[PDB]
């Protein structure tokens, strides 16, 4: 029932791939639609007008010309309201952009490597996850600096985390990556709430090596997606699937799976072609009432979720589409390619 | 479905704690 017309696009001069995109669902309502694109060593702010109009805002350029974005996410000063751009790459420092003046306030040095995701929490504006390349996530709070929680270690993946997401209220994350694994971490406990009360108070960080539950029972391959809808879980691998699933049996209460649970229920499948390559994002609009995936060809994928496709094809857009995202009214959809392409699409 | 229910629910939660933010426009 979902149908849009491609109303423009534009390429980067950089020429990089650009691998993360994502509009500022914090804007109020009769504000302008923004977007940031993250590839090579930039972070550009872009907003949408009418007519397909996309008006370039500012750029960040970061001084090292070696540093690589991969990911950013938005959220918000918990006592200014002042929208904030968190972005961070290959080399494994958060910096904390004002999307005003496009200017770094401050940045985080403390992973080993790569951070592959960043996400912000549903419900506190200052509370930062991201996930990396040395095998762990880490919880940040921004309001004070402080690194709140470490997720690895004994029982934490085995490979680099591609990947994570908070559920609907913040209570829990479920993580993936290279190691084939999605693991869960409640972040309700109270350990975690406590430890998260405490970085408020300030710094001695939790060191959480035993996950609430773990799989590898979904994907054979890279997990580097995964996003909760609801109780349940999408993940995907370069298996051209995006598969739904929950951890336990059919019944089985998400609140009530013990962290050695062995099973694994799936519940449905969504199928595509031409995207076997790794490191491709899947999203969801604001109410999970659409899904979206690009492909390594420029074909872009949307499903309803309230039923259960529609293929959206431009003969310009020909290189692997890395992530999408919707305007959180979902009128519009950007995808944004290997060849520092973005594409516009406007839901009719 | 039931999960669509709670994805309903909690997705309201949170618009309605958007609803009540003004954020500054970039
Ligand atoms: N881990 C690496 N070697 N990377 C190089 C390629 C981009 C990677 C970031 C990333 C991870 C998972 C899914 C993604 C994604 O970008 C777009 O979709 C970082």
Redesign the pocket.
Known sequence: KYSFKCVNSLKEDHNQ?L??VQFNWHSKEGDPLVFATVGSNRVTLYECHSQGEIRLLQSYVDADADENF??CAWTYDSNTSHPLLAVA??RGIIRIINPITMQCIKHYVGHGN?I??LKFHPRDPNLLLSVS?DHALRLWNIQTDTLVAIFGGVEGHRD?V??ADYDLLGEKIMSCGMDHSLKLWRINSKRMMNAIKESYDYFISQKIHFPDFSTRDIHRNYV??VRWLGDLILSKSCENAIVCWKPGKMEDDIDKIKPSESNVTILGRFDYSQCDI????FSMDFWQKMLALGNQVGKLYVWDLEVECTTLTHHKCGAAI??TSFSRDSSILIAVCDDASIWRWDRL | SSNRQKILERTEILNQEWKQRRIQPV
């Open positions: 791939p691998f993360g991969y990911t790459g290959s790569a592959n995701e390349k680099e591609l990947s580097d997606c790794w490191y491709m994002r890395r992530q």
